[PDB]
Design a protein around this ligand. Structure first.
Ligand SMILES: Cc1cc2nc3c(=O)[nH]c(=O)nc-3n(C[C@H](O)[C@H](O)[C@H](O)COP(=O)(O)OP(=O)(O)OC[C@H]3O[C@@H](n4cnc5c(N)ncnc54)[C@H](O)[C@@H]3O)c2cc1C
Ligand SMILES: C=C(O[C@H]1[C@H](O)[C@@H](CO)O[C@H](OP(=O)(O)OP(=O)(O)OC[C@H]2O[C@@H](n3ccc(=O)[nH]c3=O)[C@H](O)[C@@H]2O)[C@@H]1NC(C)=O)C(=O)O
Length: 340
């Protein structure tokens, strides 16, 4: 009954049934069975990006469809990875096997199947860079479907799976394309200290993990769902006004003039690091992460997020949007709405 083991935040709520699908038929069957009994279905990888708000009235299917195949192309390696594959383990594997290209995405929690959903990205790379396609099963018809990376409509923490294809499809495999001619991505932060000519894939991996281990909490210590909020993109005008009043604010100008701000900085500037509500707190090494400090209840997390958002809104007139998927009793609910 308990969802606690299934979400990295460690939120304790119940689901009517929790089922581990080792293969597609199992997943599809679990889905058919649950929906036939009129209940909603939720597919999870490692539950590292979800916040259960209350007991879930349906079935939660843990996607454990594993296996990896490697197709050889002159120019690149094509990986067809089961949705249930652990992402970080895949990264180490590819590096181990001499197929670099995933190093900047090292240590990001979750299953490979969930990687396209919010276009996992860090240290200058997003999954859209290496994603060839995504294969899913249309739950209603058992119709397997493939979407090219372009058809996935990848965006900043966004993809078609958060829209048109949410619920209708269960991702069962992800196709990655890793160029045989490796080109390191050293544009982000401390990676700029590395030399393109000398650096090896493992060296990037270590640099990336070093920054990650110093800033981000390990869920096995304190449950968390990573960055709780998306870095907001504001109008050039809002960005101008804000930077004039807060010059040192980290910002990332978009091609169209809008500017992305670092939500973590904004939260931090509100002296929020360490703030806690109930068993939940703002992580002190990366203010963007809300953690399960001491048997946090979901309401503690919701209230804390509300507080953080309000404070940042009142100081900078920038309104943060959660990056974590809020799961209500019958399915996903609006996160912003929940924390408003
Ligand atoms: C410590 C920590 C650090 C993080 N760092 C980063 C980072 O640097 N960059 C980044 O981009 N993200 C980061 N995240 C977020 C997280 O790693 C991603 O959102 C990841 O893709 C979630 O994988 P998951 O398998 O745990 O998905 P889950 O949390 O299990 O599910 C996420 C959502 O996708 C759905 N879904 C999950 N699997 C499937 C499937 N097979 N078919 C259909 N829907 C599915 C779920 O129903 C839900 O809506 C971090 C999280 C944590 C805890
Ligand atoms: C952890 C996640 O993703 C992470 C990802 O690992 C890192 C690195 O690429 O970039 C995002 O954080 P981020 O924008 O805060 O990256 P950071 O480099 O840590 O910091 C950006 C700026 O904010 C500042 N910053 C950040 C947090 C803080 O508490 N204080 C602060 O001042 C930094 O010093 C920096 O100058 C992700 N988030 C989003 C929401 O886009 C996640 O999605 O769960």
């Amino acid at each position: 009954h308990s969802l606690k083991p299934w979400n990295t935040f460690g939120i304790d709520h119940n689901a009517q049934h929790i089922v581990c699908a080792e293969d597609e038929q199992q997943l599809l069957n679990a889905w058919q069975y649950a929906t036939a009994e009129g209940q909603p279905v939720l597919i999870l990888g490692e539950g590292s990006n979800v916040l259960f708000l209350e007991d879930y009235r349906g079935t939660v299917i843990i996607n454990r469809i594993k296996g990896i195949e490697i197709h050889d192309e002159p120019d690149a390696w094509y990986l067809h990875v089961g949705a249930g594959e652990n992402w970080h383990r895949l990264v180490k594997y590819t590096l181990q096997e001499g197929m670099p290209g995933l190093e900047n995405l090292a240590l990001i929690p979750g299953c490979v199947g969930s990687s396209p959903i919010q276009n996992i990205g860090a240290y200058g790379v997003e999954l859209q860079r290496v994603c060839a396609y995504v294969d899913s099963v249309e739950l209603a018809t058992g119709k397997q479907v493939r979407l090219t990376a372009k058809e996935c409509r990848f965006g900043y923490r966004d993809s078609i799976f958060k829209h048109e294809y949410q619920d209708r499809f269960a991702i069962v495999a992800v196709g990655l394309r890793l160029p045989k001619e490796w080109q390191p991505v050293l544009t982000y932060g401390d990676l700029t200290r590395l030399d393109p000519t000398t650096v090896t894939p493992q060296q990037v991996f270590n640099a990336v993990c070093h920054m990650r281990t110093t800033k981000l909490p390990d869920p096995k210590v304190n449950g968390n769902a990573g960055a709780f909020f998306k870095n907001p993109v504001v109008s050039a005008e809002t960005a101008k006004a804000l930077l004039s009043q807060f010059p040192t604010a980290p910002n990332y100008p978009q091609a169209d003039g809008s500017v992305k701000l670092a939500a973590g900085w904004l939260i931090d500037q509100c002296q929020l690091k360490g703030m806690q509500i109930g068993g939940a707190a703002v992580h002190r090494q990366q203010a963007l992460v809300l953690i399960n400090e001491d048997n946090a209840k979901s309401e503690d997390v919701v209230q804390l997020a509300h507080h953080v958002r309000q404070k940042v809104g009142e100081k900078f007139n920038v309104w943060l949007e959660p990056e974590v998927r809020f799961i209500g009793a019958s399915g996903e609910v609006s996160a912003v709405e929940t924390i408003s």
